[PDB]
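Record 1 of the preview.
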Amino acid sequence: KSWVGTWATAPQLVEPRNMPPAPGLTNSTLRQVVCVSIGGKQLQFRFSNRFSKSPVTMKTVHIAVSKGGSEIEPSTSKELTFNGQPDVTMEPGKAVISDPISFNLKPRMLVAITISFGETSPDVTGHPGSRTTSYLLAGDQSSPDADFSQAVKTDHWYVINGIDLMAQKRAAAIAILGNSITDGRGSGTNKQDRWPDELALRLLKNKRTRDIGVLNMGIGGNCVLHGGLGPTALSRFNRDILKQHGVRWLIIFEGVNDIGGTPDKEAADKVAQGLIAAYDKMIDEAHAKGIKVYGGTITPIKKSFYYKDYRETARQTVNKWIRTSGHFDAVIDFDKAMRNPKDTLTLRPEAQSGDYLHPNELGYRIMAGAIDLSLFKE
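->
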């Protein structure tokens, strides 16, 4: 057996507007909920301080089955350790991985991770677009019987980075690079129904693909080339994709924010060529590690705040390259799945959030339903 990722979230420097509310993380206890893909029996948990400039101390970390909301099944709670000890300090810019731990992890299990912090970094490493409520209490509230029913709610994740499990060679993971259309803006809070979540459900029910996990490395507002929110896709590619465990496929579905940021035709045409070059660079680097790469066509923007005629031209340039260049190992045509048959330059009205840019839950289900699962064999 060897490690295979079952859940991950892509880290960044948290912006002030997305910081934890009072009472803050220092000397407080934070309960967070994640939804895994594949199950297993022996796990490790990864925590990141990659974007913080001060050390961060976790006095204790516990894991348990979440019962919804902030509640847990207390008989399932276990403590993590880090070289035998319950407490660990992360160095500035670094991550830590727990000791391996036995836990009955079922497919699509909701896992509550409870961290009691000591001193923390005001530049926080986290993932603002969690689409999931986290719960904060002042003090050290690490007992499995602690009451969180009154905790301060925050719809962000902090510090947590991944869960991997030990599996046999038939087990593997898909890693997915994207923006908020992949991170799940428009999906239901606490409903774990981002399109990669909907893909995980389809894989788990298809007997042939039941041991294939899904690692959602979307970042809300992300760019491939420059600017945007969080580190660019090119900058984070090694950490967020190539260093994951057990990955045998990458889906690249990103670039709308690069196009959306352009002020004129000249700039938009340059971004289209830059995206194509960036796709080729990431395809090559993944291929050199034996990973197959599938390309997602960029979905419609007309009627959204991003629409301009010259931006639409760039989008079409990129999509024609995705569809026809042959450089991707296959094409996942999300544009074809999401576009209105009656007005192909706009999203299906009933499958979007009101902004004509982000799908809604139905749209994310349609997008996952358009993926041929035969792309993930062995």
